[PDB]
Amino acid sequence: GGPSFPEPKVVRSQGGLLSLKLSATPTPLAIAGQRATLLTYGGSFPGPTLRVRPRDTVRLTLENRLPEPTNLHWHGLPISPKVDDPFLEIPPGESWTYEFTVPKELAGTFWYHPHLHGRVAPQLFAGLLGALVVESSLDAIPELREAEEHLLVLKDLALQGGRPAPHTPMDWMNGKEGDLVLVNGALRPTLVAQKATLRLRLLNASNARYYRLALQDHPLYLIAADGGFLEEPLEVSELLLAPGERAEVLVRLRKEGRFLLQALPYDRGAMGMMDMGGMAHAMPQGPSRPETLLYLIAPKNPKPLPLPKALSPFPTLPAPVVTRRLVLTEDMMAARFFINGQVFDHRRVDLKGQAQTVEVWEVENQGDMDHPFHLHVHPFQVLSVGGRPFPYRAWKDVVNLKAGEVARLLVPLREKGRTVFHCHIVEHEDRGMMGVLEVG
Ligand SMILES: [Cu+2]
Ligand SMILES: [Cu+2]
């Protein structure tokens, strides 16, 4: 009813339970004015949005109908690595049921995708991704209850012969970006706002593309990061989202009109082919060209709601017991990527920590590309990057590091078990940039 806007179908918990059988299958679909066969969850691209509340039980049976093995990563969920098992392999024609309980204080936008080492980048690029939304009591305050809410899944694509384009040697080095820059699987959709205040949940599910988001004539009011709410709204003129990151923002439409949401130029350090070249620029790729993500039409006579005065206080964390240093490095021509000089070995435990303690992790990017660092299972607080303070307090699970930047993270260790940390330019994860944490 009303104007339509492309957005994944939502599956909601009922009576405290979200039970769903989700098949991973090659699927012919309509895409940007053409037909292409993608790999999808639940027959759609993006996959369905799972919407739950804290304390819900999720029982998701993943039916592997792919020609290769796969698994799921429950990205951002602070659950057991025995459930969110990065080492599990589901063979073709087999199923696996993931069962877990939504933590009581959790809120925000999360997502699910494959995590079978060696095949993450082709599988995610082919379309296997979906969102998970955890509702909050805070969603009931009038300043959020009356906002018009939408999910925006930012994910690019490239097609060749009616199927996802193959990975090239350059893609393994830079990570693969596509020429079709899509929102919720649609090319430059139009959102005709019925309310003057919007609450946009934002998900970068791309392999490697960065989204330097800006809305014409409007600031954004950041109310949530990857893994939960900020303590109060933070006004920004623009918002960079690296692969794997999420945010939620309020938009306050002041005037009537049509406003572009853009991904402004951003140079993440990707490298071009050659050396033999023109005069000054042809080695690095340089900044991305600007892209139009969607058109936003304000309602008539728009009168936005007041911003909420507070959101969620951020828990004070105990003093840390351990300091760790994780150094990221690259060998670009070999397209090999390292942490503390090693490539991932699933039979090698790299860090051993104690459950119910807090550590500080210093993650240092000694490469020339941006690398977005992700830690499974244990959300963290970013204290500083480059020795300067982070701009807000909120749970994160991906932190972007530009060349030479060192991030200092407070990592509370929660669930026992063996889990992983890795770059979320998933090509780099496939090519080495992953290590193993064991919590006891
Ligand atoms: Cu992820
Ligand atoms: Cu990387």
Automatic annotation (TrEMBL):
Pfam short name (any one): Cu-oxidase
Uppermost EC category: oxidoreductase
Residues engaged in binding Cu(2+) 3: H115, H376, H422
InterPro entries with a match to the protein in the record: Cu-oxidase-like_N, Cu-oxidase_2nd, Cu-oxidase_C, Cu-oxidase_fam, Cu_oxidase_Cu_BS, Cupredoxin
A GO molecular function held by the record: copper ion binding
Keyword set includes Metal-binding: yes
Domain of life of the organism encoding this protein: Bacteria
Statement: the UniProt record of this protein carries the keyword Oxidoreductase: yes
Keywords of the record: Metal-binding, Oxidoreductase
Segments forming domain Plastocyanin-like: 31-137, 173-264, 325-439
Gene3D superfamilies xref list: Cupredoxins - blue copper proteins
Annotated positions binding Cu(2+) 6: H376, H422
EC numbers: 1.10.3.2
Transmembrane segments: none
Binding positions (Cu(2+) 4): H281
Binding, Cu(2+) 1: H73, H374
Binding residues for Cu(2+) 5: H371, C423, H428
Entry-linked PANTHER family: MULTI-COPPER OXIDASE (PTHR11709), MULTICOPPER OXIDASE LPR1 (PTHR11709:SF2)
Protein name per UniProt: Laccase
